[PDB]
Design a protein around this ligand. Structure first.
Ligand SMILES: Cc1ncc(COP(=O)(O)O)c(CNCC(=O)O)c1O
Ligand SMILES: Cc1ncc(COP(=O)(O)O)c(CNCC(=O)O)c1O
Ligand SMILES: Cc1ncc(COP(=O)(O)O)c(CNCC(=O)O)c1O
Ligand SMILES: Cc1ncc(COP(=O)(O)O)c(CNCC(=O)O)c1O
Lengths: 325, 321, 331, 333
């Protein structure tokens, strides 16, 4: 028995979810003949109020396809320096996609300073290959992107005729925490990546959502990168289950994280950045070893709660920290 | 309700396979903690007599990762012009991996002429970025590569200190049909891609097999291309089931494929496994008879094609004249 | 004191050409303010009957910029397997430009079989990133591309909505040899690369010619690859000189190459196809290559799978007779 | 004639340089048989105290080849966000070379904070393709990179097993201004790009300098990108002339830049930091008023320069030219 607070990616499929997977109807998705994948994508597109959706094996591929579908060779994509697309995806957009990544300083709430983005945007000129895309992240390290800011960024992106992509790997965490609908949070975006394999608890994959044309380009690029699966409907049906059954209960992950951060408050902790299911802490190797020895797992120290974290688990790791001091 | 001879990719997971998936133990594969994936990779590496294995969502990615792990920016990979990596994978190796694809003419048996490969190989020179890889395909359009040729190609690549990669998407078809063990057919290769999502009947994915160092590079690139999954043990366990339970019965696909070609004696040396090649109005009639298939017409048999299906499509062809 | 038959690239600038360079007016080409470059480009574009032209340090960059301006990421370019763009430019179009190179068998006259090309073309589909370009080469190994063939390829390219690019590194050799003007030979093409640094005798560079939009893309890509020079008018003026003064005399290079092939095809032990001598190249085989090259090099005679001898303005009549004697001496 | 303070790239070849070009011996550089190019490369490599040198048509290609020769596919190169390699070369190293560019904040003197560099460095790992290169710039917007800082960065890169590349497009400006020789200033670097087509006054090209192995790779990539010229010895000999004859006189460009800046900073409506005038550049902003009306006014009087107004001095800028644009500014304000 381990208390795994390393990430919400360690979520296991519930028995009800496994049961759903057992009876999932499948087909060849390359021929577009998997009813499970078709259902998830149809449901996903409508849920976010967009035209089309595309199922992919990972959030990394979801973003990778997103940037390559917005930007061609040499074209620019502006994003945060602390964004996952920049920091934790091996710069695949540049290395594989020949896209010019244009990092700008990222703020606490995950916002990019309008002045920084505007200064970063390169025009379509004689010697300048134009910026084409701006990327945002919601949530960003468990923090919710403020909606008034989002509207302003949409305005800036429109001013230069650019596109707007959302890394919403933990979008529904922002939905539940802020109290705004998913429609309201993705309305200013042209494209959205949502991960099904974190808090939502599905075992594999993410969904890329956007316009028909955008998704059409992403689907062709998905084949090239190796994302074109066959009978993925079993996976897709699990992802569909997650969206229908595992969104509301995310509030508990937020509560236990809030309850965890409060208890841990020799530990420096800012409760203002505990807005969803993450707790960031600062005082390292002896601590991790100590915790490891007590069946407690995490990785600035980051603690993430999920559906396989329970009330007693929280109290055990609060005890463990107290004991450590 | 349809007789689907389009591809062996339309294979559905058996109920027994679904049960295996239901009870599969999983974990976060990125942390390497998925017991289902680890088991498949361990079994696969051992089955082919290699050091390590890597589970990926598709055969396209398996090959894509393979040449990029063999060939760095500007470096060359020699393969067949009719090879899947060249013709049917959007040249991802070049576009994404900056690898110089070096297609050579493909022979009847699916082999690459030794003279062509020798002539294609570019040395490590002042203005030449060296060829680093040679790719083969077994099977290729259902045809089995002769083993003496395989050992011989190994000799050629060794002569230039190169690597040898096998697209064995349909390797086990070649195993069953030729009568050689899997070990004998993958021995000349440095790396092997085997597809689990075709004849073997698993719903998703392939296995890339090779040395520890090679797979280590492939595993790093898998993360970049977006192949890094979480609880893929459910998928992996199905792949494990397929390898353990669905290899022997591939002979039936070969039997039904051969009997199909035999039946088309109205109005054959390339029928060695589960494919039948023949040379729009035709498609309309066949579709109307619940018959689905795909310049040259390709008919593919698999575990959801039965004896009555075969004679039914033979009847359609005869009736069509 | 060497007889250099290795290539027509070893051509040195004449004193007249040097004088022209000395008095060349220059400026910052990045600002488009070099009168020498602009003059060469204006003249070059007009000579080939296209809208715009771009001066580049090499024919390799000329072709590299050409396919990348025709083909974006993942898009396809059909070419000959023996074409320079495929065989001798390190596949930069693919490695650097993410262009899908699509080789088809290349014939003797440099033509690509329409059936082979038609079979290679990938449509704009759900899973197929479209072919966008077909590349041809004139001359190809000193051989002239047949003009009737071009019209038919032009037909095919229009039928599939593609572009057509000509590697005319030695185009003016084909002009002199065939008796057709340069305009007639580039008319079916959307874009043309011509090399100034071979038979024409300019010391550096090539010209990429095409539409305004195409060149605009090529000019921006030139900056990225590092081809954007400053006061290149000195080089450009030499190229203008070459185009104005060194085209007609290519007939002599062809004559000396033909007389060379005649002399060597008499000698026993020599295999030589005189039908392949149409311009300034002689391809030959012994009935080993390396011992011959060392033997020739020691006698101040330089050339290079198949033995290739290339004539240019620094080859004279006596030079031809000396290497004929040398082969005779060697055999 | 125009008084062109837009850039030092507009430098024209002197008659002496043109004479040198006329008598330049040439050959096919691809065969390595151009005596003019070989001489320039030999002289240049020794001048910077490195093993080998490579002649290229531009500084962009010099840097482009540099990063790709240090960094393989997916590998990382750390540089300044205000560095030319990042901002003004279309990210060719990334787009063409598949190199992961890693910008960090760049300071006034062109230095990168070591803490920022340490945070940027990715190790050779199971999932991070390692950083391989750190890039610096001297001069940077005409500022001179402090040598003690350089020593510290060398320590950092050795500690992490990285390479160090200098964009020394205006290195010799830093040489004259700081009083340190070119050898001392490039000693900590593994590779150096020097531009011949600016202050040095040669019409075309740059030199990439480094180890034999590094240059051998660069020479191969040069062929691929299209930098392999034939008889470029005429250009190279001009570059050789520039290095031998036009380095010392860079001090005059610096004097005229300072005299220019002093005259303009004595005018109301001008914001000018005289501490940022260390070489041949003067950066100024109006306090206030738009930039474009000033430029149009100046252009109409045969005066040319260029977000922030930048004035660059060179060998075709003379004292009377300087006094004339001060008068024009005075007249305009
Ligand atoms: C914000 C964000 N975006 C994209 C991804 C990539 O998704 P995949 O890992 O499914 O490719 C992650 C994964 N983040 C892992 C973690 O936070 O532990 C993420 O946190
Ligand atoms: C020999 C071969 N190799 C690789 C692949 C690609 O694998 P995925 O499709 O799983 O990515 C295929 C697909 N072949 C499809 C067919 O023959 O119908 C194939 O036939
Ligand atoms: C047909 C053709 N096209 C393009 C090029 C490339 O041009 P540069 O070498 O200027 O980059 C060459 C060079 N051919 C050299 C020879 O055959 O000797 C060529 O022969
Ligand atoms: C610091 C620096 N680095 C590299 C380059 C590129 O060199 P080429 O322009 O020769 O490619 C320049 C040109 N800078 C032009 C200017 O500042 O006006 C530069 O100033």
């Amino acid at each position: 028995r381990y208390i795994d607070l390393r990430s919400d990616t360690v979520t296991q499929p519930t028995d009800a979810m496994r049961q759903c997977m057992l009876h999932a109807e499948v087909g060849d998705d390359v021929y577009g003949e998997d009813p499970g994948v078709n259902a998830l994508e149809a449901y996903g597109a409508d849920l976010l109020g967009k035209e089309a959706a595309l199922f992919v094996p990972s959030g990394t591929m979801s973003n990778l396809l997103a940037v390559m579908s917005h930007c061609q060779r040499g074209e620019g994509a502006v994003l945060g320096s602390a964004a996952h697309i920049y920091r934790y995806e091996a710069q695949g957009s540049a290395v594989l996609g020949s896209v010019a990544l244009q990092p700008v300083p990222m703020q606490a709430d995950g916002s990019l300073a309008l002045a920084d983005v505007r200064a970063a945007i390169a025009p379509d000129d004689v010697y300048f290959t134009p910026t084409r895309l701006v990327c945002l992240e919601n949530t960003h390290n468990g923090k919710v992107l403020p909606l008034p800011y989002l509207r302003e960024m949409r305005e800036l992106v429109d001013e230069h005729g650019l596109q707007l992509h959302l890394d919403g790997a933990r979008l529904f965490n922002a939905v539940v925490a802020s109290g705004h609908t998913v429609r309201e949070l993705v309305a200013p975006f042209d494209s959205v990546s949502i991960c099904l394999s974190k808090g939502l608890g599905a075992p594999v994959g993410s969904l890329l959502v956007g316009s028909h044309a955008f998704i059409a380009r992403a689907r062709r690029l998905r084949k090239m990168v190796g994302g074109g699966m066959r009978q993925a409907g079993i996976l897709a049906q699990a992802g569909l289950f997650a969206l229908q059954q595992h969104v509301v209960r995310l509030a508990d992950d937020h509560r236990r994280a809030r309850q965890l951060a409060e208890g841990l408050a020799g530990i420096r902790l800012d409760l203002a950045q505990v807005q969803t299911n993450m707790v960031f802490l600062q005082l390292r190797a002896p601590l991790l070893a100590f915790m490891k020895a007590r069946g407690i797992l995490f990785s600035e120290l980051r603690l993430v709660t999920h559906l396989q974290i329970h009330d007693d688990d929280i109290e055990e790791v609060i005890d463990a920290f107290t004991e450590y001091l």
